[PDB]
Design a binder for this molecule. Structure first.
Ligand SMILES: [Mg+2]
Ligand SMILES: [Mg+2]
Ligand SMILES: [Mg+2]
Ligand SMILES: [Mg+2]
Ligand SMILES: [Mg+2]
Ligand SMILES: [Mg+2]
Ligand SMILES: [Mg+2]
Lengths: 96, 174, 153, 159
RNA sequence: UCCGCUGGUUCCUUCCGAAACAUGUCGCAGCAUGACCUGACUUGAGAUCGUCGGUGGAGUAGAGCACUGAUUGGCGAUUCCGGGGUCCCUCGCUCGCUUGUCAAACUCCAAACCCCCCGUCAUCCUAGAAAGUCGGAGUCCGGACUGCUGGGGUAAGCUUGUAGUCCGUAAGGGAGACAACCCAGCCCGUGGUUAAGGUCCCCAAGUGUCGACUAAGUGUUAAUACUAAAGGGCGUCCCAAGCCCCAGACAGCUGGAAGGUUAAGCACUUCAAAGAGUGCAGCUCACCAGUCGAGGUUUGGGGCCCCGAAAAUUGACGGGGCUCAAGUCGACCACCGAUACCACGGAGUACCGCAAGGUAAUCUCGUAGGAAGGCGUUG
RNA sequence: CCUGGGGCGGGACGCCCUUGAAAAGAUAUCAAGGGCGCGCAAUGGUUGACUCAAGCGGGUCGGAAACUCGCUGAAGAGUGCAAGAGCAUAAGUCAGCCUGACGUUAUUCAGCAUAGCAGUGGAUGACGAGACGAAAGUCGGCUCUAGCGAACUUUUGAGCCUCCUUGGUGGGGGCCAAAAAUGACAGAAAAGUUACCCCGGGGAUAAUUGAGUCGUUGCCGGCAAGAGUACAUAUCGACCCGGCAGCUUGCUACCUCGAUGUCGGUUCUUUCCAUCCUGGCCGUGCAGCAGCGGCCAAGGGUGAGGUUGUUCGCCUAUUAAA
RNA sequence: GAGUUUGGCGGCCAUAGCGGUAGGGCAACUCCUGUACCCAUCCCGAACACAGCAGAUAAGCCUGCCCGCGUUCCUUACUGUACUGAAGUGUGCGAGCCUUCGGGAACUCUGGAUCGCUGCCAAGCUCA
C-alpha cells in the first residue's frame, strides 16, 4: 500500500535543477520580510530545516509574525487558512 | 571543465577561491556588521561591512597606508602594523558611529598570535566592541615588536615608534 | 460595442461558462446585452462563444433595438419622451449615435434594464451546433450580428 | 495468439525492463540487410504505416524475412540495402483464476509505431526500383497496419 | 425477547432541497465524525463562480538523449582486461565520428488547462459579504454520456479512478420505441415566432434549387452497449506527374524473323528488317517497312460502389416505397415544428414598504430530508 | 475481516518511498517496483585539516591484485539499511576536545488537502543547564522522509497530597514521568463440523438458463515460403496478418434466490447451411470405373443394433448416405 | 565635481565555464626570501604562521583577441507542425480521428551575437 509520510510524492517538488544544485545563494537566507508582506513559498530542497510541507509549494503566504529565524505565514490550502512556519531560505518576495 | 549542460559551475567567488559561502551564511545570520580583516603580504586592511541584496556595502575601512601620516615608518605588514591598523579602524568606526561587529577572518587560518588577532586586539583596545577570546590575542611584547634582537638591529626602532604612533592616534581621535 | 445575444440554453452547461453568462446577464435564450470593447469583456465573450452570438453593432441596429425592446423598471417600454426627458438628444436615434460614438452610455438612461429580451429570429437562424465560420450562428458575426439582430427585432 | 490481441494502442509504454521480470526476447534477428556499405544508392523508398499500431516482434521478423527474401531473389544479395528502423521496445504481457490479480506475465515484445512513421527503408538502383517496391508491398502484408510506400530519394529518377 | 435482515407506516398546499464520498469501526447489508441540504440567531463590509495584465508553482502531453537504463548498423583505434588453430599473427568487448530506435518508476528541454497572491473589469452585497453559535436530518448499494491513448484486461452493456454534465429526483418537443443522446430545464389560459429535427406517403411543411457521384435496393443508422475487417477491383468519377505522340505512337491488317549454331535452341566485316531463343524440324512473339489517322501506356493521391460477406420462428431504412432520388457529397432557398422566446390576462412565492403597494432578465422542476401554513374525525 | 461469489492461496489488515495520478491539491483496484518492525558510545556532537569514484602516466618478482607520486575529475563516490530527495572550503573522510542520544514547556502542521478524527511525529520557539569554536554559529542523536501502540493493571524514578473524630506506626489510594502489548497494529482473554440441519435475507453474491465479450473452440480469408519429377495456387498450405459464428471451455455479474423443475433418452413439430447422400456444374497430376478439390442448391433422405446413465466416442452389419 | 588603475567585500551564479594566442605592473597584488619568535606538520615552514632586502611579471591578476567545446539569446524554415482549453446532429467497423474559435512548443536548420554585467567602500594618481 501507499504511505502517508510528509515527503510523499515530492520527487520533483523537492528537487533542484541541475545548475542550481549545491549551495544556494546566501542572500536569499537573510531577506528580511515585513508584517503583512506577500511572499511566495518556493521550497529550497538543500535547506532541510524549517521547511513547510510540499503541499504548500507554490502558495503565496501573508507574513503575520516572526518566530526566531523563521516567519509565520497565513497560507491558503483549498478553502482553509493555515499557519505555515518557514525560514527565509524557502520564501521569496512578490514584486509589483 | 564544463563538459556538458549537466555541469554546475561554482559561484564566481568560489571559482576564484576567495569566498566560502557556508561560512558566509553562518556569519550573515548574526544580522551584525562584519569586521572583515584581510591581510596582504606587504600590509593589512580592515573593513566594516553590512550586506544588502544589491551587494555588500562597506561603512568604514583602514589600511596600513594610513600609518605614515601618524608617524609610523617600519614595516606595514607585521603584527605591530596590524595592531595599529586595527586601533585606527576601531577609533574611526567609533567616530563615524559604529561600535559593534563580529570578527570575520574569512579563509585565513585561525592561529593565536597572528596578524589578524593582533588587529582584533587593536580593535578591542580602541573601544570597538567585538566578541572574542583573549587566548587568541598576542602577547603585549609581540605587539610592541620584541622580535628584533634575533636577526636585525635596525628593527630596534619598532617599539618606540609603536608607542609614539599609539599616543598620536589616541590624541588624534580622542 | 459587442452585441452579445444568447442562443443556447442552460442545460448541460459547465458552471464556469454558466457563471460567465450570469455575469453577462444572459440567463435565457434570445437575450441581448450591449457591452463595451475592453479586453476584459472580450475575454468574457470569448469564453462563452459556443452559447451566444456576438458582433460589432452599428448605430441603426441599436437604435431600433432601443425603440422596440427597451424596458424600464416595472416592465415599462422605452419611448421617445422618456429619452428626451432623461437625455440631451432629439430621439432614440441620436442617443444610439452617441452611444456608438463612445460619448454616451446605456447607463445614461435612468432605470433602464441592461437586458433586451428579444423576439426569436424571424425565418430562423443558421443553427446552434455550428459556429459562424462553420455555417452556423454561434460565435463572432463581426458586423453581421446586425442582420441577426434585425431578424430578431 | 493472434496479433489482433496485442494490436491497438490504448495503454501506456511498458518498456522499463528493470522493474519487470523475464521478458522473452524478440525473434527478430537482423535490422540491416543487403549492402551495408554502399551509401550510393540513388533511388530510396520507405514503407510507412498509417495507423497507431503495436507490431509484435514475430510480425516484424516475418515481414523482414519476406522482404529480404524477395529482395535477394530480385536484385541479388548485394544489390539493395533494406533497413528495419524500429526496434520492439514495448513489453507485451498477457493475463495467463479469473480477473483477480490480473497483471499478467510478459509474453513478448513489440514496437509501438505512430502514423506515417517509416518501418522499412530500402535503397536500390534505378532498375531494381520496381522489385524493391513490390517486395516492400509483400512486407506490409505481414504487418497489422495499412501500409503505403513513399519514395525517399530519386523521385525524379523514377518519373 | 433480540436482530445492523424483510415488509408496512393513513390528509392538502407553499418555501428550500441533497448525498450514494473521506477517516475510524470484528468494519464491509450497520454506525460515528466531516463534506453536501435545511431552519433560526449573532456579527457588522466586504466576497470571488468569471475576464484581462503581472509577480510565482510547474515537470504532464509533446520533444529529445544532456543523466539513469535500453537499442541498430557502418567507419577508425582500445597495441593493454579477453575469445581461437617465438604467446609469430587470428580477434569479441571497450573508446571516438556518422546512422536507426525508445521509456510508466529517464530529462538539457517543455506547453495548453490548472493553483496561490496582487491590480483591473464584471457580478453579488447594508432588502446583509465573509465569519461564528445552535436546532433538524438524510447520506456512506449508485449509474450513465463526453474527455483523460486514464489503470488492469484478449475484450466486455467488465472492473476500478479523475474533470464536467446528466439520470437518480427531470416534464414538454425530436430521434420508431430509448432513465441519463439533441432542443429544453417546467405556475395557468390565449396568440405569435422559433429551437432541435424534418418537408414523397404513413405525418404539418419541398416529388425544393444549383453542381456532381452511386447502379450496388449499396444507402435511406448524428452520439451510441444499437453500425464487419485485412486484402483486392483494366466497376465508375476526378487531380497531378513521367514516357511515346499528325517528322504518323497505341490496338488491328500485309513481306521477313533469311548470316547464324548441332555453342544437340524448349533436361557475324555489315544490312532499317534474323536470338546462344516466346510457342502447339517446318507450326509462334519480341522486332524494322507499309496501313486506317489520333491519342496510348505507366505511376501516385482521392470520392462512391463492388468481391471478401455463412445462422438458425417470417420481418424490419420505423413501414410503404424510392434510381439526374425519396441515397451520398459541396452549398443554398422557403416553410413546418415545443410548455423555449416574445406579448397579453391571471395565480403563487421571495424581499422591501406603516399601508396602499413596489421590484423579480437576474423567482416558479423535483427523490431522501428540513421549514411554514391549512383541511378533516372525536371530545 | 478484505476477497471480480465463498473457500484454498494471499494480506494490497500498521508504518515508509517511486510510478499509477491526467505539470496546484486530492484520487481507487488482490495496481506495478518495493521496504520496514532494526543497527550504532560511535556508525553521535562540534572545531580544524583535507577531498571522493574511475581512468592515463612513473615506481623493483609489490604482475595486468595490494602501497606510493603527478594529471583529468561538480560527484560519475560516501553519507548504516527500501525508494526518492539533499550535500563538495560539504550533510563525506581523518584527527583534537566532548555527550545536545540534555530536564521542563508553547504553538502550528500532517497522519486526517478541502474538512471532524486517537498516541504519535516534525518544524519552529521559550525556561535551565552545558559541549566544541577567535567568534558567528552548530548541537533536542546518526542529511530528510519508515523502525512502532489507547484505556485498565503492575513495576520503577523525584517530591509532594491523602486514608473516612483526633495524633502516631505498618499498609493502601493519588498526581507527573519511564517500562511491560494488544502485528486483526484507533487495541475480544477465543478451534472445528453439519448431506440431520433450522431461521432472517440476497439476484446487494455463486451452480442455473438468458444478455455482453471471444482468450479458447468451430469455420474462413490475405500474402503466398515451399512440397508437388518441372511447375506456389490439380492437391497440401509454413511464418505473419485480418475475420465471421456463438453451436466447447472461459471471463463478467446486467436479469431471476416470496424457485423460470436442473443431464441423457423418448415423442412431435420447426428452423440455418458452413451440404453427408440425392440434383446441376467447374478443375484435375480427370483414359474408363473410382477418387481428389471447389461452386450452386435446404425439395426429400440421413436408419437398425452391443457397451456405457450418458452427451461425445468406439464397435457391428446394412445403406444413396447412414 | 569627474575619470582610469589597484585591493577588499559582493549580487546575479556558465552570456560568467573549458580551451588557445598577444600584451602590462609607478602605486597595488602575486610569485618569490628565510625560520629568532606566535603558530605547525598524522613526516616536510609543502600549507598554515611569523618576519621580509632583493629578483621576476614567467605564472596568479588585468587588457585585447579566436566560435573551437559548453551555455544563453535572436534570427529564416520546419510552422502556426506537435500538443492542447472550449463547443460540435462532424467522421471511422474499431483502436480513433476531424472542423471552428483561442493558445502554442521541443529538436533541427539559415544567418549572427555571447570568451560577463553590475553594486559598495578604500588607496592612489590624472581635476578645471
Ligand atoms: Mg511521451
Ligand atoms: Mg450529458
Ligand atoms: Mg438533475
Ligand atoms: Mg424526454
Ligand atoms: Mg420531501
Ligand atoms: Mg467474508
Ligand atoms: Mg447420520
Amino acid at each position: 500500500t501507499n504511505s502517508h509520510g510528509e515527503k510523499r510524492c515530492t520527487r520533483y517538488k523537492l528537487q533542484k535543477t541541475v545548475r542550481e544544485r549545491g549551495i544556494s545563494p546566501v542572500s536569499r537566507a537573510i531577506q528580511e520580510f515585513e508584517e503583512g508582506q506577500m511572499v511566495h513559498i518556493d521550497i529550497d530542497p538543500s535547506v532541510q530545516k524549517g521547511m513547510p510541507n510540499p503541499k504548500f509549494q507554490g502558495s503565496t503566504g501573508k507574513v503575520i509574525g516572526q518566530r526566531g529565524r523563521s516567519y509565520v505565514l497565513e497560507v491558503r490550502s483549498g478553502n482553509a487558512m493555515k499557519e505555515v512556519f518557514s525560514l527565509p531560505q524557502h520564501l521569496k518576495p512578490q514584486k509589483y | 571543465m564544463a563538459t556538458g549542460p549537466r555541469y554546475k559551475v561554482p559561484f564566481r567567488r568560489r571559482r576564484e577561491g576567495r569566498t566560502n559561502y557556508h561560512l558566509r551564511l553562518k556569519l550573515l545570520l548574526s544580522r551584525q556588521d562584519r569586521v572583515v580583516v584581510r591581510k596582504s603580504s606587504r600590509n593589512v586592511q580592515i573593513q566594516l561591512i553590512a550586506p544588502t541584496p544589491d551587494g555588500d556595502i562597506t561603512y568604514s575601512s583602514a589600511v596600513s597606508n594610513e600609518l605614515a601620516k601618524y608617524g609610523y615608518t617600519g614595516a606595514t605588514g607585521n603584527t605591530t602594523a596590524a595592531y595599529l591598523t586595527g586601533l585606527l579602524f576601531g577609533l574611526k568606526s567609533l567616530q563615524k558611529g559604529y561600535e559593534g561587529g563580529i570578527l570575520d577572518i574569512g579563509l585565513q587560518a585561525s592561529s593565536a598570535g597572528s596578524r589578524v588577532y593582533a588587529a582584533l586586539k587593536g580593535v578591542v583596545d580602541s573601544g570597538f566592541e567585538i566578541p572574542c577570546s583573549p587566548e587568541v590575542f598576542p602577547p603585549d611584547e609581540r605587539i610592541r615588536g620584541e622580535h628584533i634582537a634575533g636577526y636585525r638591529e635596525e628593527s630596534s626602532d619598532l617599539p618606540e615608534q609603536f608607542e609614539a604612533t599609539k599616543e598620536k592616534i589616541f590624541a588624534e581621535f580622542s | 460595442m459587442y452585441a452579445v445575444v444568447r442562443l443556447r440554453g442552460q442545460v448541460n452547461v459547465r458552471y464556469t461558462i454558466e457563471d460567465t453568462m450570469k455575469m453577462l446577464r444572459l440567463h435565457k435564450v434570445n437575450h441581448c446585452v450591449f457591452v463595451p470593447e475592453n479586453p476584459h469583456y472580450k475575454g468574457m465573450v470569448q469564453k462563452v462563444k459556443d452559447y451566444v452570438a456576438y458582433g460589432k453593432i452599428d448605430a441603426k441596429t441599436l437604435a431600433e433595438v432601443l425603440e422596440n425592446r427597451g424596458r424600464l423598471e416595472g416592465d415599462t417600454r422605452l419611448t421617445e419622451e422618456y429619452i428626451r426627458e432623461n437625455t440631451d438628444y432629439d430621439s432614440i436615434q441620436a442617443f444610439a449615435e452617441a452611444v456608438i460614438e463612445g460619448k454616451s452610455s446605456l447607463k445614461d438612461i435612468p432605470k433602464l434594464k441592461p437586458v433586451f429580451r428579444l423576439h426569436p429570429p424571424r425565418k430562423g437562424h443558421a443553427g446552434i451546433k455550428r459556429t459562424v465560420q462553420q455555417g452556423g450562428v454561434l460565435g463572432n458575426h463581426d458586423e453581421n450580428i446586425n442582420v441577426l439582430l434585425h431578424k430578431m427585432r | 495468439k493472434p496479433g489482433s490481441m496485442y494490436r491497438n494502442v490504448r495503454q501506456r509504454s511498458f518498456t522499463r525492463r528493470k522493474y519487470m521480470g523475464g521478458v522473452p526476447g524478440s525473434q527478430v534477428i537482423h535490422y540491416d540487410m543487403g549492402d551495408k556499405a554502399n551509401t550510393s544508392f540513388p533511388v530510396k523508398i520507405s514503407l510507412i504505416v498509417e495507423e497507431k499500431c503495436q507490431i509484435r516482434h514475430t510480425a516484424l521478423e516475418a515481414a523482414r524475412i519476406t522482404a529480404n527474401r524477395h529482395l535477394v531473389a530480385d536484385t541479388g544479395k548485394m544489390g539493395f540495402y533494406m533497413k528495419l528502423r524500429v526496434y520492439p521496445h514495448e513489453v507485451i504481457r498477457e493475463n495467463k483464476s479469473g480477473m483477480r490479480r490480473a497483471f499478467g506475465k510478459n509474453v513478448g515484445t513489440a514496437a509501438r509505431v505512430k502514423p506515417m512513421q517509416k518501418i522499412f527503408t530500402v535503397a536500390v538502383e534505378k532498375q531494381n526500383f520496381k522489385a524493391a517496391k513490390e517486395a516492400l508491398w509483400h512486407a506490409g502484408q505481414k504487418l497489422p497496419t495499412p501500409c503505403r510506400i513513399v519514395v525517399d530519394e530519386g523521385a525524379e529518377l523514377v518519373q
